[PDB]
From Swiss-Prot, chains A, B, C, D, E, F, G, H, I, J, K, L, M, N, O, P, Q, R, S, T, U, V, W, X, Y, Z, AA, AB, AC, AD, AE, AF, AG, AH, AI:
Keywords: Capsid protein, Formylation, Helical capsid protein, Host membrane, Membrane, Transmembrane, Transmembrane helix, Virion. Residues 38-46 are cytoplasmic. It comes from the Viruses. The modification N-formylmethionine is found at residue 1. This is Capsid protein G8P. The keyword Membrane applies. It is found in: Virion; Host membrane. It comes from Thermus phage PH75 (Bacteriophage PH75).
């Protein structure tokens, strides 16, 4: 025998792996305009 | 199975795509007078 | 559906269109004496 | 049989759809002066 | 039925409409001297 | 509705109209001796 | 009811009315020597 | 019968109505110097 | 009964009244040299 | 997709094209007397 | 739309047209004795 | 695995590349009259 | 209300009136020997 | 409206009218001996 | 496009053409007695 | 109450009154040699 | 035994190492025009 | 890539090329009478 | 009780009193050569 | 009887009274250099 | 008892006292060249 | 590792190298007429 | 034991050491033309 | 006897000792760019 | 007995003492270029 | 390109060619009696 | 203990000491031609 | 108050009074031989 | 690299070379009658 | 208190007093030969 | 305590004392030829 | 370490060394005709 | 320490020493014919 | 290094050498008839 | 202290002392033939 929290509690392990790709696209994408927003919004001003 | 943060959390992905056109018209338009404002406001002075 | 930043965030679009007429009258009018100020103030000197 | 969280827990699905129109009018409207506030408040200064 | 964020959350809609008249009088009035301040303060100098 | 930069931002419009009469009396008056200063100061020399 | 930004936010309205008299005496007075400074300082030179 | 959250939970309804008058006097009053603070503090500088 | 934000939240009302006298002496006094600084610093130059 | 600073930020491009004709008439016209002012004012002197 | 530097910035255009008549009377008049000053002052000498 | 800030956060990288061409046309174009403004405005004066 | 550049900016108006009497005594007095200098210096020569 | 260089810049117009009477008395008077100086000084010589 | 210093800066071109006729009448006329002054003044002497 | 920019911002009012006496002694004194410099430097030359 | 926050909590350690290269390219690139923007935008002005 | 100050900042390059022809006609033309003015005005005197 | 911005915020009141003596010595001293610089540098030239 | 939140919950009432004196000395003292910092740091610059 | 924000929160009181000596040496020293920079940089120019 | 401000922040290094050639052509070219303008405009006068 | 902010928080210590060399090359290089820009741009003018 | 919460409940005592080294590396490392981020990101801007 | 928050909760007391030396080196060091950045970056400009 | 002082500055070239015919008639004509004046006036005397 | 802004914030103290030698060579050197530029450029003219 | 150009600008008034005695001795003395030079040099010739 | 004031600032070098031929024809030609004017105008007189 | 432009701005007052003795020796001395130059250079001629 | 702008801001006080000796040698020396330039250049002419 | 304004800010040092050769050729060359212009233009006149 | 305007601003000191030899050769040489021009041009006339 | 007024300002040195041969031919030639004019015109008279 | 126009502006004092010996030799020498020219040229005539 063993305790079964180990193989099966782990599924979450994928719960956190999946968001990296879409999860990031949201900040990757929010952040995306976030830094560009400074120049795109900034440089014509001078 | 899979986790469904991926197809459906993505809708936001359009939340950020839509502002580029109107979102920009505001700085595009604020910025619009912002650079023109310098010459239009500047050159008659000399 | 769509996101509604597009029709309604646009109202500002008129916020920037209105000043062109009064907004300009101020520099149009400040600038107005600004270039005239040079000759009107300058030419009698010679 | 099935579990009934699916048809009936969904009503909320409209709870989030309704605010897009009024919900946005508040930022659409707060934001509305928010970008216009910069030029309307800015350009006469030059 | 419907959700009631729509009729009643809207009251704010007037919260933003009222300042346009007094709200503007402050920049309208701060700005008021702000552009005039340049000539009134500027032109006697030449 | 409309935006109120137009009736009330205009007050400055008088800020620039008033100096023409006193504003000019200063150059009108500085300039006044400025051209006369040349003959009044010049012609006895010959 | 109404929102009370309108009667009470207005007090500033006097904040801008008061400086016209002292506020001007400073440029009225700085400017005062500013134009006179040119002739008073200029004309004896010829 | 009915459920009594409706007549009696409403008392709060006055909890929010009362601050508009004093509640505003604080921003009305903080804000009061806040816009005036710019000219009163600004215009003598020129 | 009534809600007591009204008599007692008001004390701040004096928090803003007191600075007008000392509060102003600082800009009144910073500003004090600020406009004088221009002539006192300017006029000997000509 | 693309970023929209390019078509719409360009409007200014006309902001600078328009002054060439009126903008120049002011120096064209200030300058106009400026060179003529030398002979018209100069040659009778000899 | 158009930019309004063109109709309204032009007012100066009259700022330069008006001096030709008075503006000239000053050199017309300073110059007036200026050439006459040579003979009127010169010819009796021989 | 890797972290995905690297491929997707980069899009901004084009946000800054695009303005060089239009972005510059504004100073390229504001600056354009800016240096020319000195001779075009200067040389007839001599 | 009115703008107060008009009564108080005018003080200069006396700044220019005072020099006529002393201001002139300097050319009146420099010029004084200036024309006399020609005969007083000239006529004994013949 | 009009520009006020015209009524008030004109005062000089009298600046040049006054010297004709005293202004001339100086050459009228310098010149006065200037032609007489030739005979008065010349004729006894023969 | 072109730069507009060329058609409009040229007006001066007439500023110099006009004096030839009146401008000359002054030397034409000052010079007029100037050469005649020698014989008219000279020949009776012999 | 009142706003206190009026009694206390005024101190500058003396900042400008004091230089008239020393302030003038500098041009009064620079100017002093400035007009005298012409005769003192000029008349021995003839 | 030991506690396992140490080997596995560390993965973040790479979360911060990766942005240095792309992370910097954004300021490296925003900053990139940021300093160049001053000369490129500045020097033609003189 | 490259920086675009080089092709587009250059337009000014024509701003300076155009005045040579009209620009010169003004001194070419002011200067024109300027040297001729000496003989035309000088030689009849002898 | 009272609010303590009044006795203790005032210390600055001396922050502005101290510079008058050293603060002035800098312009008093920069200005010192500034007016003297004109004659000391000017008068030997004649 | 009564409920005892009233006499004993009040002790805090002193918790807020004590900071006014030290609490203020920190902003009184931070603020202290904060306004003085502007002139002390500003005026020598002119 | 008492509340202990008073003796111990005060340590900061020295946090602000220490910078006056080094803190000032930085502006004392930045400012140091700042006023000297004007003459040292200015006077040789004349 | 290292920090990457060093290779990539440097790109600007070319931002400043490019203007030397076009950047100079503008003053090289403005300056170009600027010194020539003195003789070309000066020497015929004698 | 000790707290580990001391060895490891320090890495930044190099974050600030690295820019001195590239960081300076940007102002060293912007500033580079900045002082040279005055003579290179200035001296041919005389 | 004794109660055994004392030797064995203590193991946690190491639970808190271990994070100081890795635990800190995360803020040590997050903080690491956090302060450096200000200069590295700030100084090229001037 | 006593409560043991007093000897052992205090360890933090060193948590705050340690950063003063490294903690300061970061602002000491960020600030370090921060004031120097103004002159080093400023003075060559004049 | 070339510099245009050469074709257009030349017009004067005719300014000097025209007087030879009228210019001479004045001395040709003044001189005309000038030599004849000796015999016509001389020979009858013997 | 003490606060460590004092030893370490001071490094800047050298930031300002170093420019005196190179910093001056730029004005020392710009200024260098600046005064020499007047005679070297001036004296041959007489 | 009054303007102080009047008592103190007057000192020059003595600048012109002093030369009459020495100033004249130079022409009085140059002129002195100037008329005597004719007889003293003339009469022995007959 | 090098600085480009040297090849391109030189163009003026031709600005001064061109006038020698036309530039001289004006004095060559003004001077032309200038010496001839003495004999042509002189010798018949004897 | 008072403003300290009065005791310390006055030092210049000696800046103008010192040149009278050396300052005059230059014209006293330039002028010295200037009147003597006429007789010393003139009288032997007769 | 006191504020330390007074001992340390004063260093500039020497910044202005040092130029009097070298600072003057430049005008002392530019001026040196400046007055001598008139006689040395003038007197041989007679 | 050291601060790097010293090796790299120096490049300007060559910015000022290069113009001496071309920079001078412009005045060397403008001045070149400037002194020659007097005799070449002067001596034939006698 | 010292301020370095003294050793290095002095270089100009040679800027003025060098022209004495060439600088003089121009007037030495212009003046050279200038006095000789009178006899060489004068004496054959008798 | 050296200053380059010396080799290149010298070109004028030839500007004065060339006229001796043609320059003289004009007086050599005007003077030529000038002395001959006396006998050629004189001797037949006896 | 003193102002240093007095020892060093004086050098000119020798600028005027040196010409007396060579300066005079030119008139001493021009004048030399000038009086001798009358007898040497006159007496053989009788």
């Amino acid at each position: 025998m063993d305790f079964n929290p180990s193989e099966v509690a782990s599924q979450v392990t994928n719960y956190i792996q999946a968001i990296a790709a879409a999860g990031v696209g949201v900040l990757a994408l929010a952040i995306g305009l976030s830094a560009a927003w400074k120049y795109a919004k900034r440089f014509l001003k001078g």
